[PDB]
C-alpha cells in the first residue's frame, strides 16, 4: 500500500520550495521513521538540512501552521484524513511544496493451523468507490469453526473506547476512528482488545452492500420489533421480512427509535450477516462463486486468498450442512467526558468498556475456536 509525506505551507505563502526553509514542524515523537526518511530524501535531492520543531501530532502541526506559529509543516497523507475531522476545509488552506511517495508492506493473511479462523467485517459509512476513506461503523468479528460448524458473531460498538493500534498510537478513542487510519488499524485494534488472531478481513461500504444484496436476490430475516428506517420510508413489522437492497440498508442503519438503540442495530446487522450467509451458501451461489467475485470485486476489499475461497466453497459444496450462528456484543457505559485521540478539541460520545462483558466476550470466542 501507498502513502506520502509532504512539506506543506499556507496556500498564499511566499515560500515556493524547500530550500527556502530552515526548519519544519513535525510530530517526531510519534511518526519519526517516516519523517526522517522525508528529511533524508530532502537532503539527498536538494542538499538542504532542516531542523524539526516537534509537534505533539499532525493535527497540532496543522494548528500551528494556520495560527502562523510555524511557516512549514510535514504532513503524512494518512493523518490528513484525521485532520479533516476537526478541519474539514484543511486541503483548501494549504499548498504542498515537496512530496515523497512511500509504500508499506501489506501484512499477509494468517492461515489457521486448525479448523477455526476469524474474519473481521468492516462496514464503511460512505457511498461510492470502495477506496473512499471513512470511519468504520460496522465492526463484526466472525469466529468460524469448520469442525463443529459453529459461527460466533461478536459486534463491538463503533463508539467503543479502545486503544487504537498503528496510526492511533495505542491511545484510546472510539473504534470507528480506526477505520480512518486503515483496515490494518481496525484489525490490530480488535486483535489487541480480544487477544485473538484475525485471519482475514472484508471491507465494504454502503454502495458495496447494496450491490451485494441485489446480486443475491435480497435477504430474509425475522424481525423482532416493529420499526421504521430512513426518515420513515421503510416500515418493518414483527415477523418474517424480505429485504431488497435499499430496505436492507435501512434495516441495518436505524438506531434511535430501537428499544435498545445502537445495541439493537448491531443485532440487526448480525441478522443480516446470517441472512447473507444463507444466500452465499446456497448451491447456486456456491457454484457461481466466480461470478459473485467478478461482480463484487470492484466494490468489496478482502485479503482472503483466492486459494482459500476455492477451498471453503468446494468444501461446502461437497459437505453441505448449515452453520449454527450465535451472536454477542461488547457492553459498556456511554460517556461524553473522555478525550478522543483523533478529535481532542471535540466532546464526543464514547462507550467505556465493561470489564466483565469483555471477559465474557473473550471466553466465548475461545470456546468457539477450541470446539
Ligand atoms: C464465502 C463464501 C461465498 C462461502 C463459504 C461460506 C461458508 C460455508 C463458511 C465460512 C463463512 C465465511 C468464511 C464467510 C461468510 C461471508 C462473510 C465473511 C460476510 C458476509 C457478510 C458481509 C460481507 C457484510 C454484512 C455487513 C453489514 C451488516 C453491513 C455493511 C454495510 C454498512 C457499511 C452499514 C453501515 C451501517 C451503519 C452502522 C452506519 C452508517 O450510518 P450513519 O453514518 O448515516 O449514521 P450514524 O449511526 O453514524 O449516526
Q: Concatenated DSSP letters for 154-217?
A: EE--TTBEEEPPGGGTT-EEEGGGHHHH-HHHHHHHHHHHHT----EEEEEEHHHHHHHHHHTT
In whole angstroms, give the CA distance from residue 183 to residue 171.
17
The C-alpha cell at 66 is 494556520
Ligand 1 centroid, distance to 184 Cα (angstroms): 17
Ligand 1 atom closest to Cα of 289? 3
* Number of independent structural domains in the chain: 2
Pair (94, 175) in one structural domain? no
CA dihedral sign of residues 31, 140, 317, 324: positive
- Binding site members for Mg(2+): 125, 137
DSSP 8-state secondary structure symbol assigned to residue 238: S
Ligand 1 atom closest to Cα of 270? 28
- Does the Cβ of 7 fall within 6 Å of ligand 1? no
Q: Distance of alpha carbon 216 from its chain centroid, rounded?
A: 24
**Structural contact between residues 37 and 100, judged by C-beta atoms closer than 8 angstroms:** yes
The C-alpha cell at 138 is 460496522
In whole angstroms, give the CA distance from residue 126 to residue 128.
7
**Structural contact between residues 331 and 160, judged by C-beta atoms closer than 8 angstroms:** no
Pair (300, 319) in one structural domain? yes
- Does the Cβ of 152 fall within 6 Å of ligand 1? no
Name which of 212, 213, 226, 218 is nearest 264 in CA terms. 226
In whole angstroms, give the CA distance from residue 178 to residue 192.
13
Ligand 1 centroid, distance to 284 Cα (angstroms): 21
Pair (70, 148) in one structural domain? no
- Does the Cβ of 10 fall within 6 Å of ligand 1? no
Pair (259, 333) in one structural domain? yes
Pair (170, 84) in one structural domain? no
Domain boundary among 106, 138, 169: 106
DSSP 8-state secondary structure symbol assigned to residue 51: E
**Structural contact between residues 90 and 80, judged by C-beta atoms closer than 8 angstroms:** yes
Domain boundary among 87, 106, 125: 106
Method: X-ray
Name which of 331, 326, 324, 337 is nearest 355 in CA terms. 331
Q: Please tell me the number of Cα atoms within 13 Å of 202 on its side-chain side.
A: 19
Pair (137, 77) in one structural domain? no
Name which of 222, 220, 223, 227 is nearest 242 in CA terms. 220
In whole angstroms, give the CA distance from residue 175 to residue 53.
31
Query: Is 263 strand, coil or helix?
Result: helix
Q: Which residue has cell 420489533?
A: 225
- Does the Cβ of 73 fall within 6 Å of ligand 1? no
Q: Distance of alpha carbon 146 from its chain centroid, rounded?
A: 26
Where in the sequence is the domain holding 324, given as residue range(s)? 107-371
Pair (122, 271) in one structural domain? yes
In whole angstroms, give the CA distance from residue 71 to residue 7.
10
Resolution of the entry in angstroms: 2.0
Measuring from atom 45 of ligand 1, which residue has the nearest CA?
253
Pair (196, 84) in one structural domain? no
The C-alpha cell at 111 is 492461515
In whole angstroms, give the CA distance from residue 197 to residue 175.
18
Per DSSP (E only), the strands in the chain are 2-10, 23-26, 51-54, 73-76, 94-103, 116-124, 136-145, 150-155, 161-163, 172-174, 200-205, 219-223, 227-229, 234-236, 239-243, 301-302, 324-329, 332-335, 350-353
Amino acid at each position: 500500500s501507498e502513502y506520502s509525506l509532504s512539506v506543506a505551507v499556507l496556500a498564499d505563502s511566499e515560500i515556493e520550495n524547500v530550500t527556502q526553509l530552515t526548519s519544519v514542524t513535525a510530530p517526531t515523537g510519534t511518526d519519526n521513521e517516516n519523517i526522517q526518511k522525508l528529511l533524508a530524501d530532502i537532503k539527498s535531492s536538494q542538499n538542504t538540512d532542516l531542523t524539526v520543531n516537534q509537534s505533539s501530532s499532525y493535527l497540532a502541526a496543522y494548528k500551528s501552521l494556520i495560527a502562523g506559529e510555524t511557516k512549514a509543516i510535514v504532513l503524512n497523507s494518512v493523518f490528513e484524513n484525521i485532520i479533516e475531522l476537526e478541519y474539514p476545509d484543511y486541503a483548501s488552506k494549504i499548498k504542498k511544496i515537496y512530496t515523497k511517495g512511500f509504500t508499506k508492506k501489506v501484512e499477509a493473511p494468517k492461515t489457521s493451523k486448525n479448523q477455526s479462523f476469524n474474519i473481521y467485517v468492516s462496514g464503511i459509512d460512505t457511498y461510492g468507490p470502495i477506496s473512499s476513506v471513512s470511519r468504520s461503523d460496522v465492526n463484526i468479528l466472525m469466529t468460524v469453526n469448520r469442525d463443529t460448524k459453529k459461527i460466533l458473531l461478536t459486534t463491538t460498538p463503533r463508539d467503543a473506547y479502545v486503544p487504537i493500534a498503528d496510526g492511533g498510537n495505542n491511545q484510546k478513542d472510539k473504534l470507528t476512528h480506526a477505520g480512518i487510519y486503515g483496515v490494518d488499524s481496525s484489525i490490530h485494534t480488535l486483535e489487541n482488545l480480544y487477544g485473538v488472531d484475525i485471519n482475514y478481513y472484508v471491507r465494504l461500504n454502503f454502495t458495496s452492500f447494496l450491490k451485494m444484496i441485489d446480486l443475491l436476490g435480497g435477504v430474509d430475516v425475522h424481525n423482532d420489533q416493529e420499526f421504521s428506517a430512513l426518515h420513515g420510508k421503510f416500515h418493518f413489522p414483527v415477523g418474517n421480512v424480505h429485504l431488497d437492497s435499499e430496505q436492507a440498508l435501512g434495516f441495518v442503519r436505524e438506531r434511535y427509535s430501537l428499544a435498545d438503540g445502537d445495541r439493537d442495530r448491531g443485532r440487526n446487522q448480525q441478522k443480516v450477516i446470517v441472512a447473507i450467509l444463507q444466500k452465499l451458501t446456497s448451491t447456486e451461489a456456491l457454484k457461481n462463486y466466480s461470478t459473485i467475485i467478478n461482480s463484487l470485486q470492484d466494490s468489496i476489499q478482502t485479503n482472503v486468498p483466492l486459494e482459500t475461497m476455492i477451498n471453503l466453497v468446494n468444501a461446502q459444496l461437497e459437505s453441505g450442512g448449515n452453520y449454527k450462528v450465535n451472536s454477542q456484543d461488547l457492553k459498556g457505559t456511554g460517556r461524553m467526558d473522555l478525550p478522543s485521540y483523533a478529535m481532542p478539541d471535540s466532546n464526543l460520545y464514547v462507550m467505556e468498556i465493561d470489564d466483565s462483558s469483555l471477559a465474557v466476550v473473550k471466553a466465548a470466542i475461545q470456546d468457539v475456536m477450541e470446539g
